[PDB]
Design an enzyme around this catalytic site. Structure first.
Site, PDB file in Angstrom:
ATOM      1  N   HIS A  46      -8.894  -0.174  -3.930  1.00 52.29           N
ATOM      2  CA  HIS A  46      -7.494   0.136  -4.244  1.00 52.29           C
ATOM      3  C   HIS A  46      -6.566  -0.674  -3.344  1.00 52.29           C
ATOM      4  CE1 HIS A  46      -6.986   3.392  -1.003  1.00 52.29           C
ATOM      5  NE2 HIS A  46      -5.846   2.725  -0.947  1.00 52.29           N
ATOM      6  N   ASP A  97     -14.119   3.463  -5.132  1.00 51.31           N
ATOM      7  CA  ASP A  97     -13.097   2.828  -4.307  1.00 51.31           C
ATOM      8  C   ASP A  97     -13.780   2.099  -3.145  1.00 51.31           C
ATOM      9  OD1 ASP A  97     -10.721   2.015  -3.328  1.00 51.31           O
ATOM     10  OD2 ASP A  97      -9.945   4.000  -2.771  1.00 51.31           O
ATOM     11  N   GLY A 196      -2.094   3.653   4.967  1.00 54.64           N
ATOM     12  CA  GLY A 196      -2.337   2.549   5.877  1.00 54.64           C
ATOM     13  C   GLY A 196      -3.732   2.618   6.480  1.00 54.64           C
ATOM     14  N   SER A 198      -6.350   3.455   4.658  1.00 54.09           N
ATOM     15  CA  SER A 198      -7.283   3.134   3.569  1.00 54.09           C
ATOM     16  C   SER A 198      -8.187   1.930   3.898  1.00 54.09           C
ATOM     17  CB  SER A 198      -6.508   2.861   2.260  1.00 54.09           C
ATOM     18  OG  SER A 198      -5.875   4.052   1.795  1.00 54.09           O
TER      19      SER A 198
END
Ligand SMILES: NCCOc1c(Cl)cc(C(=O)O)cc1Cl
Length: 247
Positions: A46, A97, A196, A198
């Site tokens: 993502h 993801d 942030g 991620s």
């Protein structure tokens, strides 16, 4: 990271800081990642799916500060940017993801391990710690939901793994959380990953050994009661990882 503590790269030497260069020449922070071998950083799809061009990315290792240099840090380009073919995003949940970034210096080399640059081990197949286990997260993500800037210094915190049964209660995430995901949170709901963070690692000591158990993926708000941080369950993606890092 909400709550937790400021940290230095020597404490999280597998942490990768991933930036994107814009037309005009500005560089912004994108997401964290984790070095799993000298040529490979693992992160979240993502983070990249809207800008899938590998030439746009810069990867640092050995770096403790967001917009300044750290002694021993090393800068890499992305030689290959691999997104998961089955990635998807619902209202809340991101599925599959997970991304791989093949890194190389301007000279064509992979990372050179040092005291501030090290690989983290992958888990073995479907081998995850029991719920209740304490694991750590690292990142340059927001310190508070109201913040619009990221912290300048890297942070870390500790969260506990939450059972699937707990996490799939209707007032948590119901069936939006799947078997390919792990929830983790603070029992007192005061520390958490945030925007942030991620792509960055969830690391658990598993059989005495430091293991990349999860990848920061999604959640509803940050450090909100009954809304755990959600993580890509790395041990359910081993064949995908193996196949894309072979050739
Ligand atoms: N507290 C876990 C959820 O934190 C976020 C947020 Cl607020 C945003 C994003 C995002 O993708 O913008 C990702 C995560 Cl893990």
């Amino acid at each position: 990271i909400i709550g937790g503590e400021f940290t230095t790269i020597e404490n999280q030497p597998w942490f990768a800081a991933i930036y994107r260069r814009h037309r005009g020449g500005s560089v912004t922070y994108v997401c964290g990642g984790s070095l799993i071998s000298p040529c490979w950083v693992i992160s979240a799809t993502h983070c990249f799916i809207d800008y899938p061009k590998k030439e746009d990315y810069i990867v640092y290792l050995g770096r403790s500060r967001l917009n300044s240099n750290t002694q021993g840090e090393m800068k890499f380009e992305v030689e290959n940017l691999i997104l998961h073919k089955d990635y998807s995003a619902d209202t809340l949940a991101h599925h599959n993801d997970i991304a791989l970034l093949k890194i190389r210096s301007k000279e064509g080399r992979c990372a050179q391990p040092s005291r501030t640059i090290q690989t983290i081990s992958l888990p073995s197949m479907y081998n995850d710690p029991q719920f209740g286990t304490s694991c750590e997260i690292t990142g340059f993500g927001k310190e508070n939901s109201t913040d619009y800037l990221y912290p300048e210094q890297l942070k870390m915190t500790v969260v506990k793994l939450i059972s699937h049964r707990e996490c799939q209660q209707p007032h948590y995430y119901g069936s939006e959380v799947t078997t390919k995901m792990l929830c983790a949170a603070d029992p007192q709901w005061k520390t958490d990953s945030c925007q942030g963070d991620s792509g960055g690692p969830l690391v658990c000591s598993l059989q005495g050994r430091m293991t990349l158990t999860g990848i920061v993926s999604w959640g509803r708000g940050c450090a909100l009661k009954d809304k755990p941080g959600v993580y890509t369950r790395v041990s359910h993606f081993l064949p995908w990882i193996r196949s894309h890092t072979k050739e």
